[PDB]
Amino acid sequence: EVFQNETIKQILAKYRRIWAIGHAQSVLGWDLEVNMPKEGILERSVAQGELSVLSHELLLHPEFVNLVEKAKGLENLNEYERGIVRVLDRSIRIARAFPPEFIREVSETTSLATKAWEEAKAKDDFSKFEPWLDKIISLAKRAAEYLGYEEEPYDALLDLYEEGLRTRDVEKMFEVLEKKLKPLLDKILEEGKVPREHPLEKEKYEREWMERVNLWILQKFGFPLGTRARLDVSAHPFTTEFGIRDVRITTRYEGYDFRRTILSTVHEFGHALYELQQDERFMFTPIAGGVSLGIHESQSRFWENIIGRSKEFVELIYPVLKENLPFMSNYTPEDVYLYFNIVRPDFIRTEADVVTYNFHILLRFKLERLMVSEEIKAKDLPEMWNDEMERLLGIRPRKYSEGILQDIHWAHGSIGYFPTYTIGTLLSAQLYYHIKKDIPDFEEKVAKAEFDPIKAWLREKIHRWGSIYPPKELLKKAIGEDMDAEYFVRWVKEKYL
Amino acid sequence: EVFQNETIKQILAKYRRIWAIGHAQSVLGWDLEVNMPKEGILERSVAQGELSVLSHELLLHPEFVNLVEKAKGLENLNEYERGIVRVLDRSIRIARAFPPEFIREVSETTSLATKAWEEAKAKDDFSKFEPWLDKIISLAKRAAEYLGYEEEPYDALLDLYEEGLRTRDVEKMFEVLEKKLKPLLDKILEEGKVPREHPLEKEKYEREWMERVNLWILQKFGFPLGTRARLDVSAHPFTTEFGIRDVRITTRYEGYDFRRTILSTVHEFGHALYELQQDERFMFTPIAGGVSLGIHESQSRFWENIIGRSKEFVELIYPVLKENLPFMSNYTPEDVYLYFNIVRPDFIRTEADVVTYNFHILLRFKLERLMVSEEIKAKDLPEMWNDEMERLLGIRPRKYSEGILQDIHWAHGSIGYFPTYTIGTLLSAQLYYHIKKDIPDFEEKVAKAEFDPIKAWLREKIHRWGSIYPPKELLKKAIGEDMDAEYFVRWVKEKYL
Ligand SMILES: [Pb+2]
Ligand SMILES: [Pb+2]
């Protein structure tokens, strides 16, 4: 049926091994964050490394590569079998772009740069990370040359994190935002409409109270606990796919500002539902699973912002908040709504509201493009970051930790990564209007906890496709168009004005 | 220092990969029992299988095998480097003894036999497992021929589960038992000394009560929770070693008969301490970790029976039982002692007291030797089992589930396995007297929760050695003698008379 071709089948058979190591890498990663006794890190780390080299070795074995090439030279194949080849070709390609010596240099520099960044952020000192940032800039440019690119070198890094993404693509969405979203922010901020803060931010809670609420919400979403999924706690919330029938998410309980743990769980649910609603005929193959960071964040932001911060979701969860939270006997459902939608330009990207969030990514996009294109100097980055933070949000970091040092990404060498976050927020708005068309009683269904039709919509339009088509081709096919920042602007306009 | 030789080092480097897959297999196995959502079994199972073949493939790679052979031809090497070779030679040897076609036949037959046994036990029908038992008997004999053996074919299976174990060895310990332990049992059973049952067996408890007690006991043992170890719940208690700095044990809360969860946790602690107190200079090498099932059960039975069922341990935990168990306000510490040491011949091996336990293994030993030696018939096994149960314990199974069908072992094909359980019980007694010599205030230290000297004793005598020496050579070196069933008899005599 789905996989008929003989060459395709020999590929998939070998792929199972590669798939198996990945299954193990997932469990290892998850357990490291969730259960592993502190001192087990050294042995966990070596195990993780030996497998990564093994995995890489298997993917590039002459036999495997020969089969892929061969199959790529076949015209008989259906879309599914073709997907296998597109996906695996991109993998083999990216994998052999880096000379083993370079992969080594990066691992080394990265490891040491993260450690140097980690203390530099805590002690507010950019000098302890500066040199490392210059080394990371050089590697990025080299990487761009190893990968190859048509227009700009930055296209190569961007394409690394989002298949088919180009600098011109990123350049465009941010233009639409700077001219149409920026003013909307100013207007919102000056009318005193929504508040910049809320007293519920200070309300303290005991872990068990909120885990009762989160649990309740996940059950309302139909999250298959104990059967195909799990919810646990970790330093930072994340989602993992051990398989189509085993997807797990985590969250954290800060102990205060309950909005955090709630929306964070919903955000991850969004990533999980996607993996959960994959097509089981693709099990053990490279076509199963989300196609990219961008499409993936479209799913997490859909559930978090489109639904989680909507008034209906607030009414739905309101009674549950009252039952488990004592301090809730002093607030009304509107109080919770205003709380869930506060808008306030601030220093930290991870804390930014939905309106100010994308500007944090835009500035990171500008510094990144310059870093890899012109001859930028690390020692000069802090000021460019600060001037940008000031030009977009009116505020200026007073210490490195509130500015250029807040995120780990650059120290890990993740250059060209940041823009996929904006893509998700944008796509989450676009998707909303398209579903708002086939399900006009969207809001009513949310208020009543009838999410099956919405889950089913997402499945048919995005999820079931897995990695069959590249990100862009996937959108056209399912939404009849490409990404368009415009929707995000309307969504915001229609929500705050 | 420890690993100097160049050939040894190239071996250890390649071994890391093999070691890494094993690290992953452990995590996979553990998570399957402890966290995995029910439906994730298919994908977990395939992952587990692909790795086992990979592992096997790596162990037998010409490069690896050539290095081992080469090193085996070196006379310069220290005991440690030598240990590496002994261990790896035995592994490569055992691994290539079975033709790939045979490994396949067994996997197939085993899988289907376990399923057929699983229903056969539930529906009390031996016919649904009988044919499968005949197939398993044939494989066992073939296996013995593939492995090779000097005296009996059964030596080959025995050696498979306990390096260096011979049928003559097993034959001996059971002789000493049948003539010296058997009467002791009769005497004990006829004087009304210890009871055959206790009312505390019926006392019900809520999970949280007992997990407070278990937790307390593990902390009294110095079990490094959150740092190098964990305690969780699973269908059946077991211990796993993800690493020297990551060892985990589980237990279960039946909900009644609290002795079970307590001693079971202590039993597993025994296995864990062993892995925990390994020598870190052997990390990532084949010499780190327990040498065999036998030595391992010596450690679990040491802590479970030598200490866990001793009067001092009962006094130590007594106050804690009172605090968390309401129904305990009706019993005294002697009541708990009698309860912990009841003696009663019964049908189920896993439930047998320490005095009647070894007879369950002796009968399994007799049927196993005949099955692989003479031309035994599956259809005739039930009656031989029943006559043996009657000849040793006076009772006769009335249904297959109480007899020949109670254990999974044969259906898994684990023939020649059972005797390692007796070895552990025996060795746990021998060890007691040897430690009773260097630490005559043994009992006093237990009553006061001063276990460090006892842990240290075990480390120096057994644990630190890892897999450097074969089981037998290990005993001689550390205890100045070989296993001798006699000690177990005295221990029992000195405890019940
Ligand atoms: Pb996310
Ligand atoms: Pb055990």
Side-chain angles (χ1 to χ4, degrees), chain A residues 378-418:
Chain A
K379 74 154 187 170
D380 285 82
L381 288 177
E383 274 298 328
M384 289 177 258
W385 180 292
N386 282 22
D387 297 327
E388 270 297 288
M389 268 298 284
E390 195 179 304
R391 174 185 72 88
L392 301 173
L393 299 169
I395 58 184
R396 189 196 201 68
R398 303 159 298 168
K399 46 176 172 176
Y400 294 128
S401 58
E402 301 186 304
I404 194 173
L405 249 43
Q406 62 178 272
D407 294 338
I408 324 181
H409 312 233
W410 289 357
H412 279 176
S414 304
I415 301 292
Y417 184 104
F418 282 126

Side-chain angles (χ1 to χ4, degrees), chain A residues 370-384:
Chain A
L370 276 47
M371 284 159 57
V372 181
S373 299
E374 218 64 10
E375 161 56 51
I376 303 306
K377 24 255 308 184
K379 74 154 187 170
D380 285 82
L381 288 177
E383 274 298 328
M384 289 177 258

Side-chain angles (χ1 to χ4, degrees), chain A residues 13-14 16-17 19-21 23-24 27-28 30-31 34-40 42-44 46-48 50-51 53-54 57-58 224-230 232 242-248 280 283-284, chain B residues 13-14 16-17 19-21 23-24 27-28 30-31 34-40 42-44 46-48 50-51 53-54 57-58 224-230 232 242-248 280 283-284:
Chain A
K14 284 179 167 296
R16 279 207 173 187
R17 264 188 184 181
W19 175 82
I21 289 178
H23 178 75
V27 178
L28 262 26
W30 177 81
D31 170 88
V34 175
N35 309 294
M36 190 189 81
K38 302 297 183 175
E39 287 194 70
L42 175 57
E43 289 165 301
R44 175 51 55 82
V46 278
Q48 290 181 304
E50 286 301 330
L51 293 178
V53 171
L54 214 193
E57 179 172 305
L58 291 176
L225 289 312
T227 196
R228 282 175 138 143
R230 299 189 49 90
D232 291 286
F242 288 4
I244 298 176
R245 300 182 176 168
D246 193 348
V247 179
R248 314 181 184 185
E280 299 194 337
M283 199 179 282
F284 311 122
Chain B
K14 284 179 167 296
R16 279 207 173 187
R17 264 188 184 181
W19 175 82
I21 289 178
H23 178 75
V27 178
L28 262 26
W30 177 81
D31 170 88
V34 175
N35 309 294
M36 190 189 81
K38 302 297 183 175
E39 287 194 70
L42 175 57
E43 289 165 301
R44 175 51 55 82
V46 278
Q48 290 181 304
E50 286 301 330
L51 293 178
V53 171
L54 214 193
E57 179 172 305
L58 291 176
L225 289 312
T227 196
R228 282 175 138 143
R230 299 189 49 90
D232 291 286
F242 288 4
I244 298 176
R245 300 182 176 168
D246 193 348
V247 179
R248 314 181 184 185
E280 299 194 337
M283 199 179 282
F284 311 122

Side-chain angles (χ1 to χ4, degrees), chain B residues 267-268 271 297 300:
Chain B
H267 178 83
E268 295 317 314
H271 285 292
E297 280 283 284
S300 60

